[PDB]
Amino acid sequence: GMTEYKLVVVGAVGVGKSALTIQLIQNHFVDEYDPTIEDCYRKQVVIDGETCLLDILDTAGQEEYSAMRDQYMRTGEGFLCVFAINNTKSFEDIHHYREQIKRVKDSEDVPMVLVGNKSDLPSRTVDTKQAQDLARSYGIPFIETSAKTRQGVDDAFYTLVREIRKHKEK
Ligand SMILES: Nc1nc2c(ncn2[C@@H]2O[C@H](COP(=O)(O)OP(=O)(O)O)[C@@H](O)[C@H]2O)c(=O)[nH]1
Ligand SMILES: *SCc1nc2ccccc2[nH]1
Ligand SMILES: [Mg+2]
């Protein structure tokens, strides 16, 4: 089979995880999608000439059993850590997602990309500089996105695939 990249989208409720995923997969903006639904999605794409499958888990937070969270973290190869540029708490929450994923995978080298979503809104509490400072501390890419206009969306997911490739070649 063609290579499949297992991607996991994490972040506080309301940041745009579902909107980002649906924009990536279906090329439309869905402005109301139940915040409590956690589902997988698939898309066959070409990234730098490689035909591959994106197998994406759109997370929704707590699980019936914490074992289910640990399971998807171990299964996932790369993580989109999403905050919204108008939600400071969601930005602060990134520290917890970073820690938890590393903790479950028992790894210091987990492919991740920092994503600041809702860039189409002038209303902003997290400046680009602040997010750059955090991404610098982590040594991971940082991309501002709009699930509404599609700006940065392919970049966010394709960058995560590229980070996974860098991890695999070691
Ligand atoms: N303006 C704007 N609204 C967005 C964007 N992404 C998501 N939203 C809205 O933010 C709300 C939460 O989005 P959702 O995808 O359900 O967030 P999730 O809980 O992280 O899955 C919805 O009302 C979406 O329409 C975006 O990039 N721009
Ligand atoms: S629902 C199929 C599925 N489960 C996943 C876990 C982590 C990353 C991708 C996944 N797809
Ligand atoms: Mg959602």
Swiss-Prot record:
EC nos: 3.6.5.2
Phenotype for G14R: In pylocytic astrocytoma; somatic mutation; increase activation of the Ras pathway
Protein residues bound to GTP: 11-19, 30-36, 60-61, 117-120
Location of the motif Effector region: 33-41
Annotated effect of mutating D39A: Decreased interaction with MAPKAP1/SIN1
Keywords on record: Acetylation, Cardiomyopathy, Cell membrane, Cytoplasm, Deafness, Disease variant, Ectodermal dysplasia, Glycoprotein, GTP-binding, Hydrolase, Intellectual disability, Isopeptide bond, Lipoprotein, Membrane, Methylation, Nucleotide-binding, Palmitate, Prenylation, Proto-oncogene, Ubl conjugation
Effect of L20F: In OES; somatic mutation
PTM annotation, UniProt: Acetylation at Lys-105 prevents interaction with guanine nucleotide exchange factors (GEFs). Lysine-depalmitoylation by SIRT2 promotes its localization to endomembranes in endocytic pathways.
Topology of this chain in the membrane: Lipid-anchor
Family that this chain belongs to: Belongs to the small GTPase superfamily. Ras family.
Role, per record: Ras proteins bind GDP/GTP and possess intrinsic GTPase activity. Plays an important role in the regulation of cell proliferation. Plays a role in promoting oncogenic events by inducing transcriptional silencing of tumor suppressor genes (TSGs) in colorectal cancer (CRC) cells in a ZNF304-dependent manner.
The protein's name in its UniProt record: GTPase KRas
